[PDB]
């Protein structure tokens, strides 16, 4: 993946940063950290050969429950150039004020 | 209870205590202890979480859940017949009937050798932190505030840092609000008064709702017309 | 669509399970 | 490589896809390869999934600059999916090596564009505005719909499509 | 990057097809 | 995944790399 | 000596053992002797137990560098044990005297390799993840399973195999695969 | 064995170290110390000739209840190089792009 | 290039190094130049430090597959460092030019590998092992040790080495172990 | 090192086999 | 596998049980 | 235990020493 690595490193670094500033992190969130790094080593090991695409779907949709659960885990950002409503940059160029038998025409 | 138990976190009580300049050294560490003391001293069943969890019996003994505080009932998993308190002094001891049980710690002593039993038990509603979670009923909050205030003023008065009139007033207020909270969390609702009414008015009395899980304690008792 | 050495290692470990040597005929 | 227009037809019968390759000088060697359509059911993070909804290979249409621009109009009923409750994912590929002078990060074969039907959202907004006309109070469902739409927008623009589908299925279908 | 079972199946089948 | 042909050529190139 | 690959086949039908001797300039005279398979029922600390599950002698197969590499594919159903609920212990012996320039600590004739089936753990993780997908709460059993697996890993890496057997039999024995 | 001797020596040394720093150790722990050195005496004398492999199994599994029971008795560490998930260092060496009748083929 | 065996002997004597160039047919002309051993106290962000712990030039030997595979078995007592409270950085410098057409990023002239002694860490973890058995309590020590190790692993394999030394100094620099008995032992 | 009875049986039986 | 003196002592002590002297015939 | 053959030879050698 190469990204579960980054998320896990960030999460555990934040965990130990909190244990440096404070002396306590909720164990309900240590559970999430445990699940996260266990999954990453699961997927970056010899057990990555037993996964179908349905299993991949389920694993991703279950890991996204951990996304904004705590400050240690964040929503990952990917390189995206899309949106729900796109822009229309097409241009209009008819031919000498012509039309078809029913409608307009262009170049 | 007429009202509902909407849950809020423990420092909601420290929101309210620390208004008082003489209670500014109270902490969540003290709040936890005195809140547990108040929860137990009041013994209100609506404050606990109703849970059901099945265990297996090895030989007249079974492992008990971690968060158990009290047992509503115990029954056999296959028959559904409820269990009674064990009056027997020699249960699992042989020489040379109706099932029962007994619970002391993490062990439940049943009269059955090998069976699975369903236990409906009560626990404490916890927070995302492993801490108690209190009702936000302002009667409950005010009474708990007065409990913590009364304890702290008792300490200060043993030290001689509080006038006896102040402590007397605090104890009086706490006593009245303790009675008020006890009645608030106990008096039945309208829907609970229907259950009580159905239990009360019975031309043919029903005296075997313990065998079931008190399922039919509140059902209406319909007499056919002849 | 770029492949790193690790991805090729996974391909090797998958393909090795399917293939055998001359001696195994 | 980019999208010219990626829209569902106003008649709710065609799914318009009009792709083009960027005009800069060093995509001269680069062409368009294929169009793969996925829904909220068959999506996977790692590129298009198996058993996709509709695959398209662009040599089939033509018999080279014609291959740099493509336009499709898919009858949605022929795809056997609901035009109103479906979120389409449109992949495109290049099959071409750019020059060696490309600035870094620009050489990416694949893109993606999400599609939904704005007619049901328009009808919901009109209904909520009709409610607002009576007594001039804002229904809270209207604000919830607005903020949930903005949440899906943020998820799409950040690439977090799993939680995007979770919100879509949970709120704008059921 | 990540592979599933099906990805390996496609790769190996495509290898064997051209060998 | 949806592998392109050139990716397959890369795979066999790197497999016959240890030829 | 060392292990090349040591796993149960992905089809849950073979137990693969591939052993090789170290390539060292002082291990020419060292060969391979035998392969002994033990389970969690017959395992003993001091070397292979008696009445082992499967004894294998290498000079039977071959008719000298062939002796330095060995591979096996044992059909588990011929061994008459469950591929899901068995913890195979693979011992290997050398039958050879290394050179006199051997550094201190490398002249270990015997090795040991532990084997478990990873499918049941995989399916359990998928079940727990499916439970997580509902209401985004982590079951406590999932964390318990993770930490129990970590405990067995620590026990194996430290050589404390009997308590590893205890943990395995108590916690992970009932497995579907 | 030669290791029960080390474990017992460490255990009683820790016991008397505690009795030097403190003046009290749990007698529920002195009982475990007593069991430990009784077994050490019995296995390292004329009484070991009655030991079968089943007896050895039972003795070891009973002794490992003492392992992390106290601070005095500690988990022994042995020389091991294994794990529950072993590595795959096999290399792939294709020959003349040669598929076999069904499977692929290497050297 | 890759690592075949990177380990410290469990007898706390030998820092075992076994490097070999990758076997693909673009990597003929690439050879091994030197092996530089560095510690947490003399680390630099880029490349080996100017004050390393040990240097070994490969070309001062038989002069081709003997170059392409090299193995060192340094005695740690000679290096005058503790095998357990020391974390080593092994730099391997290549000598040559890979043939063209290689995919980019495979032609990395330098490779780095981190080494630590896990045996004392397992000694510390065994103390909290039995907390796994007991229910009704979180095995807090077990989780803490697992996270302590995993932090170093993660920070090593991501290349975030400086924070890796920060964690190593915080956690495991006070590790204790039995020093190797210099008079060798009779066993086999 | 620790011998069980079976170890002694093996040793003695194999010695008598060679005598 | 290496044997030290006490293992040998145990082996001899076991073998002495089975054997006799000539006078014992 | 297995007692491969050279262990038996060692035992013979020791025993036969003070023979």
Short mmCIF file of C-alpha atoms in Angstrom, two decimals, chain D:
data_model
loop_
_atom_site.label_atom_id
_atom_site.label_comp_id
_atom_site.label_asym_id
_atom_site.label_seq_id
_atom_site.Cartn_x
_atom_site.Cartn_y
_atom_site.Cartn_z
CA UNK D 1 -5.27 14.25 -19.35
CA UNK D 2 -8.56 15.79 -18.23
CA UNK D 3 -12.35 15.88 -18.58
CA UNK D 4 -14.20 18.24 -20.91
CA UNK D 5 -17.71 17.46 -19.67
CA UNK D 6 -18.70 14.62 -17.32
CA UNK D 7 -22.45 14.95 -16.80
CA UNK D 8 -25.66 12.94 -16.71
CA UNK D 9 -28.12 14.09 -19.36
CA UNK D 10 -30.94 16.39 -18.28
CA UNK D 11 -33.40 13.82 -19.68
CA UNK D 12 -32.01 11.25 -17.18
CA UNK D 13 -31.37 8.80 -20.04
CA UNK D 14 -27.70 9.26 -21.06
CA UNK D 15 -24.40 9.44 -19.18
CA UNK D 16 -22.20 11.92 -21.04
CA UNK D 17 -18.43 11.34 -21.01
CA UNK D 18 -16.23 13.63 -23.13
CA UNK D 19 -12.55 13.10 -22.37
CA UNK D 20 -9.52 14.85 -23.85
CA UNK D 21 -5.74 14.77 -23.53
CA UNK D 22 -4.01 17.95 -22.40
CA UNK D 23 -2.82 20.34 -25.10
CA UNK D 24 0.74 20.75 -23.79
CA UNK D 25 3.52 19.84 -26.18
CA UNK D 26 4.85 16.71 -24.43
CA UNK D 27 1.66 14.63 -24.54
CA UNK D 28 2.08 14.32 -28.31
CA UNK D 29 3.01 10.65 -27.90
CA UNK D 30 0.24 10.06 -25.32
CA UNK D 31 -3.21 8.85 -26.41
CA UNK D 32 -6.46 7.66 -24.77
CA UNK D 33 -6.68 3.97 -23.85
CA UNK D 34 -9.97 2.88 -22.27
CA UNK D 35 -13.01 3.94 -20.25
CA UNK D 36 -14.07 1.84 -17.24
CA UNK D 37 -17.32 2.58 -15.39
CA UNK D 38 -17.87 1.57 -11.76
CA UNK D 39 -20.70 2.21 -9.32
CA UNK D 40 -20.87 2.52 -5.53
CA UNK D 41 -21.14 -1.29 -5.35
CA UNK D 42 -18.10 -2.37 -7.41
CA UNK D 43 -15.55 0.36 -6.61
CA UNK D 44 -12.09 -0.47 -5.31
CA UNK D 45 -9.39 1.95 -4.19
CA UNK D 46 -6.67 0.34 -6.32
CA UNK D 47 -7.90 1.35 -9.76
CA UNK D 48 -10.94 -0.14 -11.49
CA UNK D 49 -12.31 -3.31 -9.96
CA UNK D 50 -12.94 -6.67 -11.56
CA UNK D 51 -16.37 -7.45 -13.12
CA UNK D 52 -16.88 -3.74 -13.94
CA UNK D 53 -20.15 -2.20 -15.10
CA UNK D 54 -18.99 -1.18 -18.59
CA UNK D 55 -15.56 -1.36 -20.26
CA UNK D 56 -14.72 0.61 -23.41
CA UNK D 57 -11.63 0.30 -25.62
CA UNK D 58 -11.13 3.24 -27.97
CA UNK D 59 -9.30 1.63 -30.91
CA UNK D 60 -12.60 -0.14 -31.62
CA UNK D 61 -14.40 3.06 -32.62
CA UNK D 62 -11.76 4.54 -34.93
CA UNK D 63 -10.04 3.10 -38.00
CA UNK D 64 -4.05 9.53 -34.58
CA UNK D 65 -5.40 12.90 -33.43
CA UNK D 66 -8.92 11.45 -33.54
CA UNK D 67 -7.81 9.11 -30.73
CA UNK D 68 -6.78 12.03 -28.49
CA UNK D 69 -10.42 13.12 -28.06
CA UNK D 70 -13.35 10.82 -27.29
CA UNK D 71 -17.05 11.33 -26.57
CA UNK D 72 -19.47 8.73 -25.19
CA UNK D 73 -23.21 8.80 -24.51
CA UNK D 74 -24.29 5.64 -22.69
CA UNK D 75 -27.98 4.84 -22.41
CA UNK D 76 -28.15 4.30 -18.66
CA UNK D 77 -31.05 1.84 -18.91
CA UNK D 78 -28.84 -0.38 -21.09
CA UNK D 79 -26.36 -0.52 -18.19
CA UNK D 80 -29.17 -1.96 -16.01
CA UNK D 81 -28.68 0.58 -13.20
CA UNK D 82 -30.88 3.26 -11.68
CA UNK D 83 -30.00 6.74 -13.04
CA UNK D 84 -31.35 8.42 -9.88
CA UNK D 85 -29.72 6.32 -7.13
CA UNK D 86 -26.38 5.46 -8.78
CA UNK D 87 -22.98 7.12 -8.34
CA UNK D 88 -20.77 6.37 -11.35
CA UNK D 89 -16.96 6.31 -11.25
CA UNK D 90 -15.34 6.93 -14.65
CA UNK D 91 -11.72 5.85 -15.10
CA UNK D 92 -9.57 6.68 -18.13
CA UNK D 93 -6.12 5.47 -19.21
CA UNK D 94 -3.40 6.70 -21.54
CA UNK D 95 -1.25 3.87 -23.05
CA UNK D 96 1.50 6.31 -23.87
CA UNK D 97 4.89 7.52 -22.70
CA UNK D 98 5.37 11.31 -22.33
CA UNK D 99 8.67 12.99 -23.19
CA UNK D 100 11.63 13.22 -20.82
CA UNK D 101 11.06 16.95 -20.15
CA UNK D 102 7.85 16.45 -18.16
CA UNK D 103 7.70 18.32 -14.83
CA UNK D 104 7.39 15.89 -11.95
CA UNK D 105 3.95 14.77 -10.82
CA UNK D 106 2.28 15.56 -14.15
CA UNK D 107 2.96 12.12 -15.68
CA UNK D 108 -0.06 10.14 -14.47
CA UNK D 109 -1.81 7.69 -16.77
CA UNK D 110 -5.10 7.46 -14.87
CA UNK D 111 -7.76 9.92 -13.70
CA UNK D 112 -11.20 9.57 -12.12
CA UNK D 113 -14.44 11.52 -12.14
CA UNK D 114 -17.49 10.94 -9.94
CA UNK D 115 -21.03 11.37 -11.28
CA UNK D 116 -24.44 11.69 -9.62
CA UNK D 117 -27.91 12.88 -10.61
CA UNK D 118 -28.70 16.42 -9.46
CA UNK D 119 -32.43 16.16 -10.23
CA UNK D 120 -33.37 14.47 -6.92
CA UNK D 121 -31.27 17.02 -5.03
CA UNK D 122 -33.01 19.82 -6.93
CA UNK D 123 -36.41 18.37 -6.05
CA UNK D 124 -35.45 18.11 -2.37
CA UNK D 125 -34.28 21.73 -2.33
CA UNK D 126 -37.53 22.82 -3.98
CA UNK D 127 -39.56 20.87 -1.42
CA UNK D 128 -37.63 22.40 1.48
CA UNK D 129 -38.03 25.89 0.00
CA UNK D 130 -41.77 25.24 -0.25
CA UNK D 131 -41.71 24.32 3.44
CA UNK D 132 -39.78 27.52 4.18
CA UNK D 133 -42.43 29.58 2.39
CA UNK D 134 -44.94 28.44 5.04
CA UNK D 135 -44.22 30.41 8.26
CA UNK D 136 -40.64 31.37 7.17
CA UNK D 137 -38.95 28.75 9.40
CA UNK D 138 -35.93 26.79 8.14
CA UNK D 139 -36.45 23.00 8.39
CA UNK D 140 -33.48 21.27 9.98
CA UNK D 141 -33.59 18.54 7.34
CA UNK D 142 -32.66 21.19 4.78
CA UNK D 143 -29.53 22.23 6.69
CA UNK D 144 -28.67 18.57 7.26
CA UNK D 145 -28.96 17.89 3.52
CA UNK D 146 -26.79 20.92 2.69
CA UNK D 147 -24.06 19.94 5.15
CA UNK D 148 -24.11 16.28 4.10
CA UNK D 149 -23.77 17.31 0.46
CA UNK D 150 -20.79 19.45 1.45
CA UNK D 151 -19.36 16.46 3.33
CA UNK D 152 -19.57 14.31 0.20
CA UNK D 153 -17.97 17.14 -1.78
CA UNK D 154 -15.05 17.25 0.65
CA UNK D 155 -14.71 13.47 0.58
CA UNK D 156 -14.64 13.44 -3.23
CA UNK D 157 -12.13 16.28 -3.56
CA UNK D 158 -9.90 14.64 -0.93
CA UNK D 159 -10.27 11.24 -2.61
CA UNK D 160 -11.92 9.54 0.38
CA UNK D 161 -14.45 7.66 -1.73
CA UNK D 162 -15.25 4.89 0.82
CA UNK D 163 -16.68 7.28 3.40
CA UNK D 164 -18.25 9.20 0.51
CA UNK D 165 -20.24 6.12 -0.49
CA UNK D 166 -21.05 5.46 3.14
CA UNK D 167 -22.64 8.91 3.41
CA UNK D 168 -24.36 8.56 0.03
CA UNK D 169 -25.91 5.17 0.83
CA UNK D 170 -26.83 6.18 4.37
CA UNK D 171 -28.45 9.54 3.56
CA UNK D 172 -29.29 10.11 -0.13
CA UNK D 173 -30.63 6.62 -0.98
CA UNK D 174 -32.18 5.16 2.17
#
